[PDB]
Amino acid sequence: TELKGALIGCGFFAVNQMHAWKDVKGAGIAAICDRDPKRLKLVGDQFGIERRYGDAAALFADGGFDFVDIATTVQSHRALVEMAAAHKVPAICQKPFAKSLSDAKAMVRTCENADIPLMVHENFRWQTPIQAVKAVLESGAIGEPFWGRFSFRSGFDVFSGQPYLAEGERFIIEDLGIHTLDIARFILGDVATLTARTKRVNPKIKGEDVATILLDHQNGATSIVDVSYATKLGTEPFPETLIDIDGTQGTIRLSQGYRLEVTGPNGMTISDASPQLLSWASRPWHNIQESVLAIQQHWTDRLSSGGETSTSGADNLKTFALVEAAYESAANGRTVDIGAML
Amino acid sequence: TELKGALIGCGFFAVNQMHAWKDVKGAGIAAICDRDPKRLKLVGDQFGIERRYGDAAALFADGGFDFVDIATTVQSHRALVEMAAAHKVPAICQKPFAKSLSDAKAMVRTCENADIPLMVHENFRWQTPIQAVKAVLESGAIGEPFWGRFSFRSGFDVFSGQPYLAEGERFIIEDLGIHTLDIARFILGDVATLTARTKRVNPKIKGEDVATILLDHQNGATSIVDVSYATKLGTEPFPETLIDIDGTQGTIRLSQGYRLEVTGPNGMTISDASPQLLSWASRPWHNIQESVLAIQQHWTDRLSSGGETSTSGADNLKTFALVEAAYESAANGRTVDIGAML
Numbered sequence: 309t310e311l312k313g314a315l316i317g318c319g320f321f322a323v324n325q326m327h328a329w330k331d332v333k334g335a336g337i338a339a340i341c342d343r344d345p346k347r348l349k350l351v352g353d354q355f356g357i358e359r360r361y362g363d364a365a366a367l368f369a370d371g372g373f374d375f376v377d378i379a380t381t382v383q384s385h386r387a388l389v390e391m392a393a394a395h396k397v398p399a400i401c402q403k404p405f406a407k408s409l410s411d412a413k414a415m416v417r418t419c420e421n422a423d424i425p426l427m428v429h430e431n432f433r434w435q436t437p438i439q440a441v442k443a444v445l446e447s448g449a450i451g452e453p454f455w456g457r458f459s460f461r462s463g464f465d466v467f468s469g470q471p472y473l474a475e476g477e478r479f480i481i482e483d484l485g486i487h488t489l490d491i492a493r494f495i496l497g498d499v500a501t502l503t504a505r506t507k508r509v510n511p512k513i514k515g516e517d518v519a520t521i522l523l524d525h526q527n528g529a530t531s532i533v534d535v536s537y538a539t540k541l542g543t544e545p546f547p548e549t550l551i552d553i554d555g556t557q558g559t560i561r562l563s564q565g566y567r568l569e570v571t572g573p574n575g576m577t578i579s580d581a582s583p584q585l586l587s588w589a590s591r592p593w594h595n596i597q598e599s600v601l602a603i604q605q606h607w608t609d610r611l612s613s614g615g616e617t618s619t620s621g622a623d624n625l626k627t628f629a630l631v632e633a634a635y636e637s638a639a640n641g642r643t644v645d646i647g648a649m650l
Numbered sequence: 651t652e653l654k655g656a657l658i659g660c661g662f663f664a665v666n667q668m669h670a671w672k673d674v675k676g677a678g679i680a681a682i683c684d685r686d687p688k689r690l691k692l693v694g695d696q697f698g699i700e701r702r703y704g705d706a707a708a709l710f711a712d713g714g715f716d717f718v719d720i721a722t723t724v725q726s727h728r729a730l731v732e733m734a735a736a737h738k739v740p741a742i743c744q745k746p747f748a749k750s751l752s753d754a755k756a757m758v759r760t761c762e763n764a765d766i767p768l769m770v771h772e773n774f775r776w777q778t779p780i781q782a783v784k785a786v787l788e789s790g791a792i793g794e795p796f797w798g799r800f801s802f803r804s805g806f807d808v809f810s811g812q813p814y815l816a817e818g819e820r821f822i823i824e825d826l827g828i829h830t831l832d833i834a835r836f837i838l839g840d841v842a843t844l845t846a847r848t849k850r851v852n853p854k855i856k857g858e859d860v861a862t863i864l865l866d867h868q869n870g871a872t873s874i875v876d877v878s879y880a881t882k883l884g885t886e887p888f889p890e891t892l893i894d895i896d897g898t899q900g901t902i903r904l905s906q907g908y909r910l911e912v913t914g915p916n917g918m919t920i921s922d923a924s925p926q927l928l929s930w931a932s933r934p935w936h937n938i939q940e941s942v943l944a945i946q947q948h949w950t951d952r953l954s955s956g957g958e959t960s961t962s963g964a965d966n967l968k969t970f971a972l973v974e975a976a977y978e979s980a981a982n983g984r985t986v987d988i989g990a991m992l
């Protein structure tokens with residue numbers, strides 16, 4: 309009756325996903341897979357998984373699972389998604405989805421031709437505060453949106469837990485800004501044109517750690533997506549995304565501390581949009597950790613109902629195009645048409 | 651010794667300039683001029699000015715003043731500055747300086763040819779809080795700046811006091827954005843390239859009331875200038891400009907209620923950068939009103955010492971270039987080279 313999952317990639321963040329898989333009603337992890345046997349043992353012992361594999365080929369060979377959860381780094385995403393599609397196994401794939409938009413399109417096509425669902429684990433839009441902003445705007449409380457700011461300015465050491473982030477020529481837009489752009493899309497709709505600027509401030513890394521992006525939404529709204537890992541503040545907001553929205557009849561302001569302020573024609577309300585601290589969660593990551601449960605529960609529900617997921621492979625293409633457009637615009641200096649990429 | 655000014659254009663805002671000239675040490679107003687005899691008489695009686703002129707030509711013929719203060723709307727600025735230059739009378743001119751960058755350049759050249767000081771009355775940079783942001787950044791408290799935001803988002807009815815604002819094809823950038831762009835230059839240095847997006851939300855006006863501008867500064871910093879007169883907030887912040895700067899060693903945050911937060915290698919400090927309330931001032935205009943005295947004292951000090959003003963006609967060209975470029979960019983969707991325009 310309960311769905312049997314396999315998780316490929318028993319890394320740092322997979323721990324959160326395994327915890328959340330327990331909590332998910334209607335699904336559970338029956339097998340795990342990691343290339344590194346030290347990590348394969350650590351996650352296997354912590355969560356009590358009998359079926360353990362050193363390689364995905366062997367995992368897919370034995371089968372006996374209804375979906376696969378791909379939590380590896382981007383290098384192996386294309387191959388694993390192609391293995392999932394070849395074996396008719398529904399697939400979740402971590403962000404970043406593919407190395408390029410081209411790779412992502414081919415991965416989406418293969419899943420559509422194989423008639424299997426594909427969800428990108430894109431969990432920032434599933435955070436409680438972000439969901440609450442969506443709910444307010446959708447209700448018509450502030451009228452039609454015309455301007456937005458989506459901001460993530462931090463000085464937190466993400467590099468200890470994720471050392472590959474300090475490594476490449478690309479960093480903040482690919483790692484983090486991908487989330488902020490997904491949120492911009494989620495709240496204000498798809499993007500027509502995009503223009504971006506990037507900068508490297510931190511001397512200890514190779515890639516860019518500041519990006520300011522200006523989005524022209526198809527509905528007429530303009531927004532700012534500004535992200536930074538070189539912002540030294542007196543109160544560290546990591547990993548909060550702060551959101552301002554102006555509409556024809558009012559405003560939404562999601563400020564630091566999950567404080568949601570809404571002004572409209574009938575006055576002004578202040579509310580607490582904080583995440584629940586789950587038993588297995590840990591501050592300040594508890595915001596992200598709740599959303600892992602939300603998105604994995606959403607996956608499990610949608611697989612039973614047989615409907616399209618929110619951050620599906622097909623949908624997530626429209627987020628990833630913005631990431632590639634941003635890198636292009638930053639190197640060029642010029643505005644980039646998003647529609648011509650897709 | 652006591653300088654004698656003539657003021658041309660006895661309008662709404664001239665009243666603030668006249669109160670301020672009273673308070674200025676080393677200068678006062680010996681004559682006034684306006685085409686509208688109701689305004690000439692109202693302002694003449696309020697401030698006890700004996701010499702009153704129905705036209706600037708006759709004023710300049712009689713003379714007996716050491717400088718001229720042009721507080722008319724933009725239409726008259728070119729002619730009055732050209733009259734000043736021909737009569738070798740130092741001139742202050744209100745914003746917007748000229749109708750176009752061409753007109754501005756010719757006005758600047760004419761004053762340089764005649765060897766007379768020309769200052770644009772551009773008073774937002776002379777506000778106590780804006781000056782404090784400059785002082786902090788100048789001191790090296792936050793290191794080299796790399797990112798900024800300069801924001802003026804309001805829903806205040808500016809149209810009652812200034813009806814002309816509701817009538818033009820152009821509105822927020824030439825009226826207000828001009829100030830915010832001047833502040834961006836003042837804080838982060840001159841701009842190499844610029845891109846802008848505009849919108850009309852308010853159905854009772856002819857011009858754009860929302861503008862989002864992305865600046866690439868010559869020193870390598872990126873900045874957002876975002877302005878709006880269609881933003882409906884719980885607390886109305888008019889007419890405060892909010893400022894965020896991020897530097898290599900810290901952050902500056904000038905937030906609503908004139909709160910100034912500076913974070914550096916030592917730690918955070920919180921200051922109250924509120925303006926003074928002069929005897930003749932009124933809430934909420936008192937910050938602007940104080941800055942009228944500051945810029946007018948600055949004029950008077952510099953005229954006595956023979957030095958150039960901060961917002962000189964020459965300097966103001968680099969502000970006005972950004973205004974004209976933003977309109978150009980808003981229609982094109984394209985980035986505009988500022989260097990090519992000057």
Ligand SMILES: NC(=O)c1ccc[n+]([C@@H]2O[C@H](COP(=O)([O-])OP(=O)(O)OC[C@H]3O[C@@H](n4cnc5c(N)ncnc54)[C@H](O)[C@@H]3O)[C@@H](O)[C@H]2O)c1
Nearest residue numbers: 317319320321342343344347379380381382384402403404
């Ligand atoms: N908010 C979020 O959802 C969030 C947060 C952090 C990281 N992430 C994403 O999660 C992904 C993984 O991040 P991480 O820090 O856990 O990486 P990690 O290096 O900690 O773990 C990756 C693991 O996958 C294994 N692996 C790699 N290729 C494999 C293959 N072909 N078969 C089997 N195992 C393989 C490695 O041995 C490694 O143990 C990244 O793409 C990252 O962007 C997402």
Ligand SMILES: NC(=O)c1ccc[n+]([C@@H]2O[C@H](COP(=O)([O-])OP(=O)(O)OC[C@H]3O[C@@H](n4cnc5c(N)ncnc54)[C@H](O)[C@@H]3O)[C@@H](O)[C@H]2O)c1
Nearest residue numbers: 659660661662663684685686689722723724726744745746
């Ligand atoms: N922060 C600021 O410094 C600030 C604030 C408000 C307005 N302003 C600027 O001040 C200027 C005037 O604004 P206002 O609201 O006082 O306008 P207003 O219409 O109230 O006043 C203009 C006055 O000038 C007179 N006038 C026009 N052309 C003339 C000429 N050739 N000779 C003699 N008199 C002439 C008119 O009769 C009128 O009384 C505008 O350019 C505006 O942008 C600046």
Ligand SMILES: O=C1OC[C@](O)(CO)[C@H]1O
Nearest residue numbers: 466470483484487547596
């Ligand atoms: O998705 C993410 O959330 C935070 C993070 O771990 C660091 O940028 C990133 O990988």
Ligand SMILES: O=C1OC[C@](O)(CO)[C@H]1O
Nearest residue numbers: 808812825826829889938
């Ligand atoms: O210069 C100015 O300062 C404030 C204002 O009056 C309204 O936009 C404008 O005219």
Ligand SMILES: [Mg+2]
Nearest residue numbers: 329330335336
């Ligand atoms: Mg379970």
Ligand SMILES: [Mg+2]
Nearest residue numbers: 671672674677
């Ligand atoms: Mg005086």
